Symmetry: C3
Subunit: 335 residues, 3 copies
């Protein structure tokens, strides 16, 4: 009822840039609330590889992917989206978690210098993709980095196939991005004055259905080296993954997905003991894993060409004690 | 069962309807096993697949791309009379993925132009299945020329969710998705050919790129839009059967969900629930059940947005009814 | 503890070339054991099509794909991997079934002239991919056919979703491979005198993400004729299928996948009555089917262009009586 929706507690949340996630509780604290978020849209040039390749990013909250928003089932997510007058394009937002008006895209078309406030009831539990979708140029905005994901946790937290609770110690959000950067006759990636200048050349690359780069956190190596995600032997980690436009097949090298909500929806029992899962373009998925061995792990899109030639590889730096029962080198490489 | 016992089975002739509509049927089976009879004439015809007038020499079952949806119940016998007209220039056959034996029926149905055949198979497994032409050595060319459709073998007790609760749809639509490989001239313009044959070698070359020039619903870009947009109402339960005989797809109802989705298309496999975007592998059909909650226009797409909005894989749903502000509301309309 | 594993019975297994699988028991015979395997790596030219197209294969045990290793859950798989001095590249092995050191790859880097022995506990039941992964040359080795699979059977054998036992009469292993063969400017496939000579050219083809060939058992038509798989009406067959780098969609033409562990993990209930299943690049899946009709069946990757233009098609020669109740030609093709 009206009075009841109006009486719900309102709560503002401070977002954090991916792969990190803002503060939240797995099990809902209190009753349904209208969770408030605010994101400013930034159109800016970003370098995506070691060769200085640029992309005119269209980023929610200034990041590629946009930040992860976490709410519980039946809460209302109320987002204030701002498109500064400094931008040159109209933007909007489609929450795959939302029901109605094309996910909210039909109610949030804001030109540079405008803002809007959209509220929707998170009626279904799971991880969902959210992305910009201006009619007539939906792919262009999405493949320019304008997408993220939200997590709608069941009020009672996560559980496995037989109702046993699954509580993670850590949670990371890996947004995978397929980029389509134009090249000149010589094969060098092109640079442009403004976003629109690249429109035509970019759509041509997009039609080949072959991305020039497939990256995590907006750039080749963004989640490797000193920016590797961390964990410890014995820790339970939830890795949320999304791809707003193209299929992906996540894999923890040296590990597994103990429980994987491959479709991303919590009412659908998770698959177990996964080596490699699949997330279709336009969806988010989530894998729960308890680390057992220390060392550096790689987390990749398992088409290894996309992982190691195109950029779809991240790292996990795990501390702890090695387990010789699980694995041991009986005879080290020798003549 | 003996041909005699099967012959003692009641027979019922069905009049097919063109996709996305489905011929009249009952969700729960009417009595016991029957021999459901269907007839389809194969038509090799030029079709236009986009607003620019791009043409394809289609190979269409019942004259449509996709071929029509045949609906029977588990343990019924599907008896198809397939006709290949004298006017056609190629041999055609049919492989029902729902069938068991002779390459899905393909090895027993090779008919040359001017020939016909009658195949009968027992629909032993419940679910939606793809059917398509498969002439040895020319299989992909016939399939990506539009020679494919789907059938639905309903459980005799109708649909049920993963927990046994009955799932009864008010309406049903069949969306056949087609990947086309159209050759282009040195200017990037699509080529036209006098006879389908003159297109073969050029088309095989494009097919090898594994990159379709068009990915469409019901044979053409925008085919299920405007006055051909599908319809529903707030509160209406709709089953959307989707098939792709040669290539993967990932259906998504923009602004909606797939409340229950048999992503593998098989009814004995519990449906996934609350789906945002599902996946149907090339060579299969899937089905999504959804109860509309909001009025307005919805786009139904293959969620590789480039395929959807650049290649042609987008349909529309016009939904009547009252807006639900509880589910969604514009607190502050776009403003300064 | 080491002492305990040391006290475990050990068994040397003899490997056989795909699509056949070495002798094993569906239900485990006895308590956990350390199952030993040995594989020598062979860099060799293989002819992949009737046009004489060659690939510089990097084959475990001399075949593409490498042989299927079968152990039971909680057994230890101990592999002695050998890289002969006749080879030119360093190789290693990642068992997706293993936990730690990048699936074993970090512990098995052997140069030509070296060997190593790796032992891991097969803690999760299902079929898993294994493949070479030299840092910086991962996809290249994998798409050169250096991959295979293992099956970790539950101690009590296979079961359906409701716990009823599923015992197969025959088992086959189909390893699907995506090759990227360079062509001279005339469209003719190029031939080389050494693996490294093809590197630069091959990487370029790989980046298009478009394979020139997609084959089963290393060559177009490999699993046909003298190598057509066999079964008899009434026989229950398990078809294990793997693809270490790219997606696939298996389909038994004229048949079905009665039970399909699509993710390849036995603890994830199998899908049933499948027409076409999906296996993501970087995984293995398994389908159980009881043949009901005699005749030649084709088994394919259901992107028909990949199956019939690119090479992804195998045959099954089945003996038995035709069942007219299941299918019958009421009127044979006629006027
Ligand atoms: O499992 N990594 O290739
Ligand atoms: O929700 N489709 O962009
Ligand atoms: O069922 N094979 O096209
Ligand atoms: Cu935008
Ligand atoms: Cu979307
Ligand atoms: Cu045909
Ligand atoms: Cu088929
Ligand atoms: Cu190697
Ligand atoms: Cu791997």
């Amino acid at each position: 009822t009206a009075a009841e929706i109006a009486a719900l507690p309102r709560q503002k949340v401070e977002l954090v840039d991916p792969p990190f996630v803002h503060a939240h509780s797995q099990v809902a604290e209190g009753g349904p609330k209208v969770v408030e978020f605010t994101m400013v849209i930034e159109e800016k040039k970003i370098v995506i590889d070691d060769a200085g390749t640029e992309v005119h990013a269209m980023a929610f909250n200034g990041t590629v992917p946009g930040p992860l928003m976490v709410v519980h089932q039946d809460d209302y997510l109320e987002l204030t989206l701002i498109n500064p007058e400094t931008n040159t394009l109209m933007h909007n937002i489609d929450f795959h978690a939302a029901t109605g008006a094309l996910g909210g895209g039909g109610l949030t078309e804001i030109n540079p210098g405008e803002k809007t406030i959209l509220r929707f009831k998170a009626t279904k539990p799971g991880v969902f993709v959210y992305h910009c979708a201006p009619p007539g140029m939906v792919p262009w905005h999405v493949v320019s980095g304008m997408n993220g994901a939200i997590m709608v946790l069941p009020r009672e937290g996560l559980h496995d196939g037989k109702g046993k609770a699954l509580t993670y110690d850590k949670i990371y959000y890996v947004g995978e991005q397929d980029f389509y950067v134009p090249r000149d006759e010589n094969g060098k990636y092109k640079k442009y004055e403004a976003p629109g200048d690249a429109y035509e050349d970019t759509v041509k690359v997009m039609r080949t259905l072959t991305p020039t780069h497939v990256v995590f956190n907006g750039a080749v190596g963004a989640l490797t080296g000193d920016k590797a995600m961390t964990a410890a032997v014995g820790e339970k980690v939830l890795i949320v993954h999304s791809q707003a436009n193209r299929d992906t097949r996540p894999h923890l090298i040296g590990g597994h997905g103990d429980y994987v909500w491959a479709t991303g929806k919590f009412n659908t029992p998770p698959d177990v003991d996964q080596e490699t899962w699949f997330i279709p373009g336009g969806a988010a998925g989530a894998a729960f894993y308890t680390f057992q061995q220390p060392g550096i792990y790689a987390y990749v899109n398992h088409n290894l060409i996309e992982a190691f030639e195109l950029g779809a590889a991240a790292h996990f730096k795990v501390t702890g004690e090695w387990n010789d029962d699980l694995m041991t080198s009986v005879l080290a490489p020798s003549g």
